Design a protein around this ligand. Sequence first.
Ligand SMILES: *[C@@H]1O[C@H](CO)[C@@H](O[C@@H]2O[C@H](CO)[C@@H](O[C@@H]3O[C@H](CO)[C@@H](O)[C@H](O)[C@@H]3O)[C@H](O)[C@H]2NC(C)=O)[C@H](O)[C@H]1NC(C)=O
Ligand SMILES: CCN(CC)Cc1ccc(C(=O)N(CCc2ccccc2OC)[C@@H]2CCNC2)cc1
Ligand SMILES: [Ca+2]
Lengths: 97, 744
Amino acid sequence: QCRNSIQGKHLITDELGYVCERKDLLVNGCCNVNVPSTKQYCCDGCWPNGCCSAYEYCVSCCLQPHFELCLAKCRTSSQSVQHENTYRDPIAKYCYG
Amino acid sequence: PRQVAQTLQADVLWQMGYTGANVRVAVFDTGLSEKHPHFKNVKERTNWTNERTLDDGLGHGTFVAGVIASMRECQGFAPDAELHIFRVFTNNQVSYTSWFLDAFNYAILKKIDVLNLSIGGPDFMDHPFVDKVWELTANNVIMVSAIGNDGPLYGTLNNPADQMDVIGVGGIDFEDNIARFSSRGMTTWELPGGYGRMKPDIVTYGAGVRGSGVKGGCRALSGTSVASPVVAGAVTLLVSTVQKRELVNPASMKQALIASARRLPGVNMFEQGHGKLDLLRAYQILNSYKPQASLSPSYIDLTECPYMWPYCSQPIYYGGMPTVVNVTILNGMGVTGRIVDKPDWQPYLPQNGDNIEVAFSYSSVLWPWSGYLAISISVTKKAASWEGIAQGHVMITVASPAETESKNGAEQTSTVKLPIKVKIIPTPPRSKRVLWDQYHNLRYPPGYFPRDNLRMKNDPLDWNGDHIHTNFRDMYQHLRSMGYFVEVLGAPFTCFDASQYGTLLMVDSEEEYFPEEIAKLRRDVDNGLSLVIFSDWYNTSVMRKVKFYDENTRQWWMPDTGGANIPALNELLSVWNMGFSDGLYEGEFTLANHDMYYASGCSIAKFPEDGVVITQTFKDQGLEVLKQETAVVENVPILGLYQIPAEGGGRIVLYGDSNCLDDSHRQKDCFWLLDALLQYTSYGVTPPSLSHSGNRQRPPSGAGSVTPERMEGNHLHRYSKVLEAHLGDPKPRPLPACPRLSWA
Ligand SMILES: *[C@@H]1O[C@H](CO)[C@@H](O[C@@H]2O[C@H](CO)[C@@H](O[C@@H]3O[C@H](CO)[C@@H](O)[C@H](O)[C@@H]3O)[C@H](O)[C@H]2NC(C)=O)[C@H](O)[C@H]1NC(C)=O
Ligand SMILES: CCN(CC)Cc1ccc(C(=O)N(CCc2ccccc2OC)[C@@H]2CCNC2)cc1
Ligand SMILES: [Ca+2]
């Protein structure tokens, strides 16, 4: 029974390091590896500065060969906003670096 | 003395053995004392403010927590709740978004169940905050917040209580009358193009409820921030009653309260939502609940009211603007949902359903636990001369991933009806039809737009939406009482048929005007359409004085524009050789034996000679703001009538102040004047009051008057719908296409 990123709107990241669409997620909490939609340690949407455009990609890249630490870290925090009410980089708000 | 918990019969649930056990409740307030005698199971206290203390200096976090989980004296709903106290407010109730963002993550880390936010803010364009609430609610946190304490004005809702996924709580009194302070109205995210959802969700007692004191005892407080924790206590208590905890999510919890509320008699649904909370009945609904989708409101009836106001205020007819009801979907089956196919409109031919055509827009994916279904209703041609009732229902289907217990892996499914009932009447004559301009309104939150009456220091923003159902509600009701059918224009001037409407009413406009719009409007007026323009103050010098420091963002804010965008109106009004001045005026005056009050309006700089201009004496408010000196100005042109020389042409009425029809802080109402001016525009009848008056004077010629100018480096383009963000000398975008609907 894999732990997973519960909140994903379209995607889910499993504690094994895969990113999968909701439709392909198993009822055991793991991503279905047998389906091509499941990708391993997918750092897509991530820039060299360690920031990513999607939460699940951030979590997956954080587990590149720690789950709670990656889950908490990738979230937007006070360090991701400027003047309290604007993102510093709206396109890459999630950062694992 | 009173006990709110007993008034809602919470002790009946206590006798059943339910007391809030193992429910993790987070109170986001001014903190709590270290060893307060009234509380058990206070598992943590943390501080997210810059102040170095976890104690409750103000006592608001103590009152809120006690209403939820107090066990002594004035008792609470959930004595055994696992309280979590996160101090995010100062002793004077100041807070910042970064504090909330950091605290919200910690609440996710600690897997809290019920979160209470007693103090909200008008801003909803703060995307970092709004996204975190969605991320929070996506992690199964039931959020409860107050709608605000700025009533009885409409359009005064607060965020995040105005979100679809949050339970927004209002305030009634112990006689079940709506508390005067409680915020009311529809949401305003969707304006001008759309329509707002129904808020508040439910109301509860918020007048003189007694709760814990800082060191002990009990004390009284009033507000919707008092009404919110009453629901958080009920929500915490109800969550403990559920045998199968998995059924509890933000959608299902909200559905229970919605369906168990009691409807206050004589009050509309934008004041009470679904009604007053009923704790016992809500418990019964959860006891027999099945994961299902539901709609708020559950049915459409534009005929029977006062519950369904404004929709009952006037019937529909052929050629009228579409009637839109933004209906909320709550999906208790999953965080992510979907609408299987197009919703189905099913008219009842036995009851004239075919006289209606219904259109639908909806969310791509319902997330988190909620979404919307906007229904647009219009009358077909066959009913243009018909009077009666048209009926039918709408069917939607929601699907969500497979539940854990289902080994089959099939999608969950729920089907919901939505009855529709409408009153149709023959299309009224043009003279009786008034079009209301909403497209050219700009408002906070998006950007800084100053107040209209500069004496109202306490409210420095224009944020109520400027709608005939929010802060022009009293104007709207009087016009209906006079027989005028008022309709709203949510798209540029290039998107309405002038031949349908006798008068176009522009009140306190801030937006720039497309060149195509000006040309189109000129032709419509030449063909018998009338313009009534109520304006407000504008001055580049006064604006630089109205500048104030915004503490919540830590940055100085300059007015994007004045009360009204006088330069933009002048570019529109040039085609008839008319314009406005950049003067400031206030003071009392009399017209036709009626007392009047000029709030901060401007004056008519230029007017055609053939027109009727009545002029008055006023105090120079511009000098006071700039230099605190006093002066009186005689013969100020504030009202101007005109008739287009072309045969069958329209009329233009100019009035320099918008505040006599606004409810925000009304001192005197100028509805008698609006009625007389609509009589002139709708029938050409010049009243004796505005023609025999001794206040008449030769219309100003505009010789030597300095034209108002746009402020240097103003950032209005960042938020304008017309202007490109060129960072300097902004220019209009291409004219956007008119909106279209896909009728079923
Ligand atoms: C009813 O109210 C809801 C919210 O209360 C409104 O939903 C919002 O609708 C807009 C479009 O009108 C959505 O914007 C979307 O943005 C991006 C643009 O790149 C794209 O995903 C879509 O094409 C769409 O334009 C917005 O996300 C949506 N908000 C929510 C929270 O779902 C709705 O418009 C209102 N309907 C009416 C008829 O007033
Ligand atoms: C003078 C009146 N205001 C206009 C300048 C100040 C103001 C107040 C609130 C917001 C405002 O909304 N938030 C700021 C956080 C906040 C501060 C204080 C109280 C409640 C809060 O939220 C829970 C957030 C952003 C989105 N929703 C809430 C913004 C501005
Ligand atoms: Ca306005």
